[PDB]
Design a protein around this nucleic acid. Sequence first.
DNA 1: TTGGTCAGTGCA
DNA 2: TGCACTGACCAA
Length: 100
Amino acid sequence: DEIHNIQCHFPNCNRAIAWKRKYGKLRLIDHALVHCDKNFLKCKKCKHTCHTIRQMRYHYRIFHSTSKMEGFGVSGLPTKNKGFQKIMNACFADQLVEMN
DNA sequence: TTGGTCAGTGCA
DNA sequence: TGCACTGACCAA
Ligand SMILES: [Zn+2]
Ligand SMILES: [Zn+2]
């Protein structure tokens, strides 16, 4: 369970993500969403939507300073959506197989 | 300012 | 096991 870099397989993406098993899937999903033009992340306190989990972290920090960010793991994401799955499998298909 | 990254981990 | 959340460095 030592940190190893996982190369993103999105076309022309040169980013690798440092990864180990305790981390789980979320930071890989989060990087895959950088390549996504849909807005699958929906705020639970207002109508705002955005592309990545990280952007939603920044949204709660700035716009909902007294709220706890909740339900933004795998279990709370639209993992059965076909467009979502396409982006995931374009980036980290090997690591995001058992996502559902 | 925005937020992509690393690093981290208690508990089911 | 790995989920789903924490704090923080630093590029743009
Ligand atoms: Zn990538
Ligand atoms: Zn909001």
